Each structure stands twice: as C-alpha cells, then as structure tokens.
Design an enzyme around this catalytic site. Sequence first.
Site, PDB file in Angstrom:
ATOM      1  N   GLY A  24       2.093  -4.454   2.972  1.00  0.00           N
ATOM      2  CA  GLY A  24       1.961  -4.746   1.621  1.00  0.00           C
ATOM      3  C   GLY A  24       1.130  -3.956   0.617  1.00  0.00           C
ATOM      4  CG  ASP A  25      -2.016  -5.315  -1.335  1.00  0.00           C
ATOM      5  OD1 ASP A  25      -0.989  -5.210  -2.286  1.00  0.00           O
ATOM      6  OD2 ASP A  25      -2.692  -6.374  -1.327  1.00  0.00           O
TER       7      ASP A  25
HETATM    8 CA    CA Z   1      -1.789  -7.243  -3.405  1.00  0.00          CA
HETATM    9 CA    CA Z   2       3.605  -3.199  -2.045  1.00  0.00          CA
END
Ligand code: CA
Ligand code: CA
EC number: 3.1.-.-
Lengths: 152, 152
Positions: free
Chosen positions: B18-19
């Site tokens: 994700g991040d």
């Molecule tokens: Ca995020």
């Molecule tokens: Ca992402």
Amino acid sequence: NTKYNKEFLLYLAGFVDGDGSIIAQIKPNQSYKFKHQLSLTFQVTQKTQRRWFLDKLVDEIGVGYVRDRGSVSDYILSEIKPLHNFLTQLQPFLKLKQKQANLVLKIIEQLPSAKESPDKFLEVCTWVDQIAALNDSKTRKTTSETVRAVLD
Amino acid sequence: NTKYNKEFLLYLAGFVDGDGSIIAQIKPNQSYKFKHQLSLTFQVTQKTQRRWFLDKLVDEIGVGYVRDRGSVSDYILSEIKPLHNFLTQLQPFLKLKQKQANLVLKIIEQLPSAKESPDKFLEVCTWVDQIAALNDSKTRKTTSETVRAVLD
DNA sequence: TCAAAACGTCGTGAGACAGTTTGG
DNA sequence: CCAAACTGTCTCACGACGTTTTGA
Ligand SMILES: [Ca+2]
Ligand SMILES: [Ca+2]
C-alpha cells in the site's frame, strides 16, 4: 454470511490501512424524512493499471464492485449488511483505521433506530463527524450542523 | 538474523504493498571505481502525525530509522544485511511488490562479485532497471545505460 | 573506495469527500 | 421514503526517485 481466511484478513488489513478508506457521509436529499441520507462506504483505491488487484478483491470478498475514474479505480463496498460482516472480521487486525471501522460498525447497528427521533438522527450524524475527524478529511461540506440547522 | 512473526509479516506485506516502496538506485559518485554507488532502500511513508506507526516498525523490525521531510515521514531500511534477512521473510506475502523484492534479493547476493567485474556490475544495473520498470517510476535519470557510457 | 546516512523534491496515486439518479 | 449505485472532484499523502556528505 461468509467467513474469511485469517491470513487473507491480515494482509488485507495492512493494505486497507495503506490505500483503503472507511467513509461516512451525510447526503442532503429532499426525498428522505430528515432531508439527508446516511451513507457508509468501505473502499480501496488503486491505479487502473492494477485494477486486476481490485477485481481479485471482488472475487475474494464475494461482494462489492470496482469503478473506474480515469487514471485510478476503486473497490467499493456500500451494502450495509455485507459491510457489517466484512468490517466485523477485519476490525481486529487494523491499526490506523480501527476506530473508523468501529464507529461505522455501530452507526450501522443504530440506523434502524435513527430515523425515528430527529434527535437520534442528529446523534448518529455526530458519529460520522467523528469518523471524518479521524480521517485525513479536507473537502467535507455537509456535517451534523448543516443538519441541525435543517431539522429547525 | 531475527525471525519475524508471520502474522506481523502478513500485515506488513499488505501495508508495504500500500504505502511502501522497494527502491534500487544507481548513484553517480566519482569516488567509486565504476563511478556509481549501487543503493538499495526499503521504505514506508506516512504523514508525520502518524509517525508513531513508523516508530513501531523500527522496534518491531529491530533495525532502520525514521526520517522527517516536513508534513511526512519515512521508515527507512538500507543496511544490506538486515535488508536481505528482512526481505527474504516478507517477500512470500507480497502481492504488488514481490518481483521488486526478489530482484533486490538477487542484487544483494551478486553485489560482492559485482564490484570486481564491470560486466557483472552491468548485469546488476540491468536488474536495477527492471525494478524501476516495476515501480511507478517518474523522475529516474541514471540507468544501466548511463553506466555503459561510463564503462567506456 | 565503500555502505550508509543525510538532505531534498517531482508528479502523481491515492483517500475522502461531493452531488445526483435509480429502482423497489 | 429508502438502500444502493452512479458520477465527479479537491487536495494532498505518498511513492520513487535525485544529489551530497559522513566516516569507516
Ligand atoms: Ca496511506
Ligand atoms: Ca499505494
């Protein structure tokens, strides 16, 4: 009422904490008793090139759908009761969004009882104010106070 | 060589997909024999108000650090040995960044011999290319081809 | 001559809403 | 009237690099 494999829920919680969003909204709509709708949404956003990954989510969660908005796409789950089931199982593995999940999960359990009293509806609306403050909210317009004004 | 809890890795793999970011760079730097440093970074970015989450990763991974860059902070892991141990264990749970993780693992293993043969150094930079190609790369400047023009 | 840290920013890829329409 | 879908957009919060310096 589907049960999800634990290891799926563990990964998924991490991804949700990363690119996901747990959202509550009050939508002005004259056709509703209190002139507003209460809308709950679980979503995961991703570059459309990776849309395949969102499509896999539809298949694995067994409900929801994917929508396109150009360079980016979203997995969307808004159906109130599949949502309750899914969030109930995901909640204990989340870390950034566990508070949002549990507000939502209780706003849900009070919808049957928030359309009766205009004051109850105002109460529930303040919980969605709470979810919004937990999130990185920047363009919010309709709050439980544009509402209270209307209920007057 | 710390062995990480599997539930932790599963969650982290989702959050990384994700991040997070798996980065390999060829850095022009005249003090090196081949005029470039090979640099590897595992990182996770998050807005600074959420730094506590990044701090936990330092404790739980047992290595690395958090840096600040204004509104945002990054958990950073570059030390080659801990990175190798860490990625070996994370990699099987990754779904978006698995290929990048494996290429970083390959690069690490060949690094020693890479510093001896210019050809072997080139092979490695070739793998750096593949990683950038797999990421959402948009500002890259130094490539395995920039290196050839210098191995000349 | 290195590994690693330090210092810095471009160009989105997200996140988190909005407003509006459908259909039972 | 209501759940749910459909359609659009604001403003970042990321990702994924770059260049330079430190200290062995
Ligand atoms: Ca995020
Ligand atoms: Ca992402």
